[PDB]
């Protein structure tokens, strides 16, 4: 059987009582003049150091006043109270010294707990700090998570102040890796140059090693004379060294320069009938269809968003409850552009069905989408903090809308419905009335290209196009897309190659679905044939599929094996 829960907790609280109320407390910890009366049994059951200290034969087996040095009062107090009741108060600040004292006392439980917390806390503004911390104390799992998150965030910001104070081995492991995310190979060059010029003779010996990890395409060009300027005077062991050493290290292109503009699709028609749906992607340049990882636990009815930093997120959705069976969950996830997997993040407060995820000013805005409460404020619009990893409510939408879309133009949120539109001001947290459309259409998508909103299609859909201008605040017609008559075109508005293109799948009577995209001429008001998608590579996707503009790597992803 198991252990009697009654006594388990009765013993735990009685042990805690003997601790707070000085009673059978034998050994006392002397830390910076602070008394800590406690027991030996509780300390032995958790800390391996304390277990080793008492069970031994040394004077500490019969001592009372141990002067535990190189520790903190609050950390030792929280560790002792956790050992006495199982309660660990993990804030967002004291986790550093918590891990320090845990590695000092060798307490595996609190070590694993704080390691998980830091694996959750890993973000941009602390990536390099957490990596240096995982290099100081051996935390290989945390070290790898840091390194990766680090890598990417490092090659996206390269302005961290902690980056200058890093060990040589860590810098070599970072720079020489094939996971850096940079659209060019010159930014890592100048990053290494500034890290070297942070000092001079303290980096001279590492100069010969850091250049050995960067390709020779920039080890013969400029930033060799700049080092000669900062070279120690009369030093003739580095100049001629770098002169006659710029020959091997075969220049090979990195992986970060493989970010092509692709058309990411979700909830596509599953090829094998064993699964409900799948996720694929179209290559406008490679002219192929690469497969994508399935949504987290086949998360259907979700929304996508691609931040200006080229990051994919997933919010809302419903999972089939354990024949129709579906329960809605407010889980949130983040897509790893390299590992080809969905990392879980802080879930939302309310569950959503088809939420409109829109990024603006670094915040992720999920505007509406079947709110659970359905109370007088049937919107529950929420914003997400990418810095603090938390959600914050914003000003609610004045009117309840269903099957709506939203875009971001001029640092503002523009949500569109059947005929009405409201603009949200993030600086003032208010909603202002906008122009009214003359046509009642729904179940459509909009793409934000420049300073104009292009509401394409609406109701199947049609070829109606109503262009809205932010500076003019008016809805005007441009043209209708020339498509085959007696068909049901499935329009998808998206921005690609600095031009407004459309992903329109049409289906004829007694005929299969045909894929073709058009390039809408902005000044001529005409959709020109940009490229025709051959059916030998792209099969049917369905009706409830979404499309978004984003960049992915063809190397990390694999081609989907499927017959034309």
């Amino acid at each position: 059987r198991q252990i009697n829960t009654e006594y388990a907790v009765s013993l735990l609280e009685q042990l805690k009582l003997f601790y707070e109320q000085q009673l059978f407390t034998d050994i006392v910890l002397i830390v910076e003049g602070t008394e800590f009366p406690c027991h030996k049994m509780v300390l032995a059951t958790c800390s391996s150091y304390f277990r080793a200290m008492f069970m031994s034969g040394l004077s500490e087996s019969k001592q009372t006043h141990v002067h535990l040095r190189n520790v903190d009062a609050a950390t030792l107090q929280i560790i002792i109270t956790y050992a006495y009741t199982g309660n660990l108060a993990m804030n967002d600040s004291t986790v550093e010294q918590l891990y320090e004292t845990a590695c000092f006392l060798q307490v595996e439980d609190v070590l694993q707990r704080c390691r998980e917390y830091l694996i959750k806390k890993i973000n941009a503004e602390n990536c390099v700090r957490l990596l240096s911390f995982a290099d100081l104390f051996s935390c290989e799992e945390l070290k790898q998570s840091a390194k990766r998150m680090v890598e990417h965030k490092f090659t996206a910001v390269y302005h961290q102040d902690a980056f200058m104070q890093l060990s040589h081995d860590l810098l070599i492991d970072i720079l020489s890796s094939d996971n850096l995310n940079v659209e060019k190979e010159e930014t890592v060059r100048e990053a290494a140059m500034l890290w070297l010029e942070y000092n001079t003779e303290s980096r001279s010996q590492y100069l010969s090693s850091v250049l050995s990890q960067i390709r020779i395409d920039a080890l013969s060009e400029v930033t060799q004379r700049a080092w000669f300027q900062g070279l120690p005077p009369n030093d003739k062991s580095v100049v001629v060294q770098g002169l006659y050493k710029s020959m091997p290290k075969f220049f090979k292109p990195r992986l970060g320069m493989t970010k092509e503009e692709m058309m990411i699709f979700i909830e596509a028609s599953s090829e094998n009938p064993c699964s409900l749906y799948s996720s694929v992607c179209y290559s406008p340049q490679a002219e192929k269809v690469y497969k994508l990882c399935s949504p987290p636990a086949d998360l259907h009815k979700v929304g996508t968003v691609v931040t200006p930093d080229n990051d994919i997120y997933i919010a809302g959705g419903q999972v089939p409850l354990k024949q129709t069976a579906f329960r809605t969950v407010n889980c949130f996830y983040w897509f790893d552009a390299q590992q080809n997997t969905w990392f879980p993040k802080t879930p939302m407060l309310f569950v959503r069905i088809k939420p409109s995820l829109v990024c603006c000013e670094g915040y992720i805005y999920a505007i509406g989408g079947d709110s659970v409460g359905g109370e007088l404020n049937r919107r529950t619009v929420e914003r997400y903090d990418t810095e603090k990893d938390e959600w914050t409510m914003v000003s609610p939408l004045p009117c309840a809308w269903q099957w709506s879309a939203a875009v971001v133009v001029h640092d503002c949120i523009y949500v569109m419905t059947l005929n009405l539109m409201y603009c949200y001001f993030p600086r003032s947290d208010s909603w202002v009335e906008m122009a009214m459309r003359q046509t009642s259409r729904s179940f459509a998508s909009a793409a934000a290209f420049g300073d104009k909103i292009f509401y394409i299609g609406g109701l199947g859909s049609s070829v109606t196009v109503e262009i809205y201008d932010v500076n003019k605040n008016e809805w005007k017609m441009a043209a209708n897309i020339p498509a085959k008559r007696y068909s049901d075109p499935c329009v998808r508005a998206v921005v690609i190659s600095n031009s407004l293109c459309v992903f329109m799948r049409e289906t004829h009577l007694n005929e299969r679905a045909k894929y073709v995209t058009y390039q809408y001429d902005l000044e001529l008001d005409r959709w020109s044939l940009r490229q025709h998608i051959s059916e030998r590579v792209l099969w049917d996707l369905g009706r409830d599929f979404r499309c978004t503009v984003g960049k992915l790597y063809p190397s990390c992803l694999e081609e989907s094996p499927w017959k034309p």
Partner: protein
């Protein structure tokens, strides 16, 4: 920090370990020798600590037990061997405790055997598998087991203690225990039972 600080820390830790190996562990402040291990492994100097530990352990062994066993090879040889094994084990209790705090990070990073296994291996290499102690132990155990088989009774718990000591010295299974004890014992038992059957077939009948 500087090399002088870590050198002094290692020197005092070695002095404390030697004092413990002298069974004077009684009056030694664990805290004031461990506050020197945390700060030693923290600065990424575990290799030097491990090498120094191995050197100190093997030097202490070769100086004390290698001389004691060879000095008392005829006056309670197995008893003194068991006593030395028990002393080594009871010292490697606190030693392994401290250097297990060390071992967590070290063997999870450097992929090496723990300090208890290190002590067992160095003991096997310097005492049991010695060029002279091994054959002497083999001969004396064969002699005493043959005298026991002859009909007269001798000490039996000491043989169990020695076999358990060798089994623990195996440190992985029954690999060394076999080569050191089973193989020699098998040849002697073979000859003994062969001679016994040859004597019985002629002196008696099938009844």
């Amino acid at each position: 920090m500087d090399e002088k600080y870590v050198n002094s820390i290692w020197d005092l830790l070695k002095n404390a370990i030697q004092e413990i190996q002298r069974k004077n562990n009684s009056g030694l402040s664990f805290e004031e020798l461990y506050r020197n291990a945390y700060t030693m492994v923290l600065h990424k100097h575990g290799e030097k600590l491990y090498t120094g530990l191995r050197e100190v352990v093997t030097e202490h062994l070769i100086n004390k037990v290698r001389e004691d066993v060879l000095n008392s090879l005829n006056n309670n040889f197995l008893q003194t061997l068991n006593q030395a094994w028990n002393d080594h084990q009871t010292a490697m209790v606190m030693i392994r405790d401290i250097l297990m705090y060390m071992d967590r990070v070290y063997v999870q990073q450097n992929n090496v055997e723990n300090v208890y296994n290190l002590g067992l291996i160095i003991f096997r290499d310097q005492v049991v598998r010695y060029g002279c102690i091994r054959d002497h132990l083999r001969q004396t155990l064969l002699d005493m087991i043959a005298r026991e088989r002859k009909g007269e009774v001798v000490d039996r718990g000491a043989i169990r203690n020695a076999c358990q000591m060798l089994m623990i010295l195996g440190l992985e299974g029954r690999s060394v225990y076999e080569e050191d004890f089973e193989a020699p014992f098998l040849e002697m038992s073979a000859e003994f039972f062969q001679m016994e059957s040859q004597k019985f077939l002629a002196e008696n009948s099938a009844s």
